[PDB]
Amino acid sequence: TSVPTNQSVWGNVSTGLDALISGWARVEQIKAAKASTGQGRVEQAMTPELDNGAAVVVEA
């Protein structure tokens, strides 16, 4: 078992969540890179949407 107790931090400041937000900003730039090239558009053309799919989830 694990838990945290008692901490200190700067006021009204960006936390680790904004470190993730940059990752979402980075993935947008990755999509924009595919958007600039026609080869990126053709890669997205092989995408079917159906009701079923393979799922996997486990700790390691």
Binding site: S2, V3, Q7, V9, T15, G16, A19
Partner: protein
């Protein structure tokens, strides 16, 4: 043969003295050699989770200020805080002191030397 043996004994003894002084310099602070991958990985993950400014900078400042014994024990417990270990670490700090010794003893000797005493003063003069 003789010169090589004589030089080897003197040089090796000199290297042993440098090793002893170098050992004392490193041994002055606590031995930084860590043999494990459990606490190092978890503490680093907890450091990024808490979002504290510079975990390495905060650790260096806290380790020297709060002492090595208190730092090493608290550092072992990567996260959480329960029981007497938590209470002691939560309300921990440095220390100062004040007491009577050389100053008061020297002043008493001046009073003993001035017995039954002689009058000394200032305030008068040409001013």
């Amino acid at each position: 043969m003789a010169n090589f043996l004589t030089k080897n004994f003197v040089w090796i003894l000199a290297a042993g003295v440098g090793v002893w002084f170098y050992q004392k310099a490193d041994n002055a602070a606590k031995t930084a050699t860590k043999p494990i991958a459990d606490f190092l990985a978890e503490l680093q993950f907890l450091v990024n989770g808490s979002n504290y400014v510079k975990f390495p900078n905060a650790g260096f400042v806290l380790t020297r200020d709060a002492l090595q014994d208190d730092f090493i024990a608290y550092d072992d417990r990567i996260k959480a805080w329960l029981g007497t270990h938590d209470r002691h670490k939560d309300f921990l700090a440095e220390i100062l002191d004040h007491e009577r010794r050389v100053k008061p003893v020297y002043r008493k000797l001046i009073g003993n030397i001035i017995d039954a005493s002689t009058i000394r003063a200032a305030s008068g003069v040409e001013l």
